Amino acid sequence: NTSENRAQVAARQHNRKIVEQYMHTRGEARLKRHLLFTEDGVGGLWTTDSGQPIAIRGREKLGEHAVWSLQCFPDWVWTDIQIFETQDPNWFWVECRGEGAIVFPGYPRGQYRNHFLHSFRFENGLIKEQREFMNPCEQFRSLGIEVPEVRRDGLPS
Amino acid sequence: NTSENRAQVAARQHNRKIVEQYMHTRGEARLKRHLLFTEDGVGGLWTTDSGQPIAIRGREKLGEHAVWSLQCFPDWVWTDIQIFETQDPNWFWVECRGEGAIVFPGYPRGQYRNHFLHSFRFENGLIKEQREFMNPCEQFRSLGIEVPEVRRDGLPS
Ligand SMILES: O=C([O-])c1cc(Br)ccc1N[C@H]1CCCNC1
Numbered sequence: 572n573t574s575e576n577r578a579q580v581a582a583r584q585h586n587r588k589i590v591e592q593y594m595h596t597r598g599e600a601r602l603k604r605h606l607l608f609t610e611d612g613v614g615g616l617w618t619t620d621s622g623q624p625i626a627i628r629g630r631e632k633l634g635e636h637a638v639w640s641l642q643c644f645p646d647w648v649w650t651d652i653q654i655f656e657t658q659d660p661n662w663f664w665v666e667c668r669g670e671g672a673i674v675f676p677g678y679p680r681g682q683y684r685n686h687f688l689h690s691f692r693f694e695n696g697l698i699k700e701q702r703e704f705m706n707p708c709e710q711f712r713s714l715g716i717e718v719p720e721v722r723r724d725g726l727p728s
Numbered sequence: 729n730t731s732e733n734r735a736q737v738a739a740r741q742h743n744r745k746i747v748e749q750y751m752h753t754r755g756e757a758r759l760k761r762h763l764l765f766t767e768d769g770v771g772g773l774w775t776t777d778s779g780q781p782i783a784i785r786g787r788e789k790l791g792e793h794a795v796w797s798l799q800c801f802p803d804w805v806w807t808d809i810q811i812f813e814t815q816d817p818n819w820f821w822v823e824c825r826g827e828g829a830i831v832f833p834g835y836p837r838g839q840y841r842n843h844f845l846h847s848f849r850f851e852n853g854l855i856k857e858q859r860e861f862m863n864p865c866e867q868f869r870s871l872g873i874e875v876p877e878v879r880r881d882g883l884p885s
């Protein structure tokens with residue numbers, strides 16, 4: 572019990588509340604979730620078919636992106652949310668699932684389910700970087716895209 | 729200053745050392761990494777093309793599975809390792825990179841590289857469950873396997 576360890580605990584506790592708020596943001600509130608980020612904050616999808624992240628850079632770019640997300644995922648809900656604090660008061664991981672309609676132009680409407688890991692890094696009590704990690708193959712299934720198969724001959728039984 | 733907290737600090741420090749040893753295990757030493765697990769411990773890959781985990785259940789099977797892994801990935805190394813402690817002294821996350829030759833039956837020999845998240849849960853100081861999460865698209869690439877391209881029409885820049 573020193574004031575340095577109290578600052579850290581207080582930081583972790585405020586940061587965790589923002590992670591919880593993030594993960595419970597649904598419907599039209601998603602249009603304001605960008606306000607949880609620093610001005611230069613980054614969010615987006617780190618696991619894509621291309622092998623490069625799609626990074627959305629800036630609090631304002633993030634609010635613009637939320638209009639596209641709400642259109643394409645109109646009823647998205649995160650479930651089975653488990654929040655992991657780390658040794659770093661400004662860095663959290665979340666393991667969860669999610670489910671909802673997927674409405675991408677040039678594909679049929681589908682139902683998308685996946686398992687997700689999210690990384691949340693903070694600066695001054697606001698999110699500086701959010702990254703989502705998932706298995707893009709499940710998104711291919713939701714879009715009617717054929718999923719390649721890797722054969723693992725010899726893989727012990 | 730309670731011994732229930734010295735109880736956990738001790739568990740966490742010991743477990744962290746087991747995560748470090750796991751993540752630095754290379755070459756022939758991989759044939760013995762299964763000895764870091766509880767008798768009933770589980771390892772494997774949670775992000776597959778099939779959408780289901782390939783879980784390797786038990787110390788003995790993990791030992792048998794390493795023979796396959798060492799053949800298919802003869803020079804595998806994990807790099808850029810970041811270990812994350814959590815509020816649970818028996819739960820850790822690792823973010824890292826990995827690369828090496830990939831040598832599968834029926835595919836041209838390749839070079840596989842990916843970004844990985846590992847989950848490690850402990851029991852009595854041995855690994856009770858290890859799970860790897862990666863982007864399966866990067867492994868398709870390494871095998872010469874075509875990766876479909878998701879189109880995100882209307883996605884802002
Ligand atoms: O899933 C995507 O293709 C996607 C890509 C970027 Br770029 C941002 C948000 C995306 N989707 C929402 C809803 C589903 C769960 N992940 C967040």
Ligand SMILES: O=C([O-])c1cc(Br)ccc1N[C@H]1CCCNC1
Pocket residue numbers: 772773782783797801804826860
């Ligand atoms: O990568 C796989 O296809 C794979 C599948 C299972 Br089942 C166990 C180990 C596997 N590979 C090692 C080496 C490469 C990185 N990941 C762990």
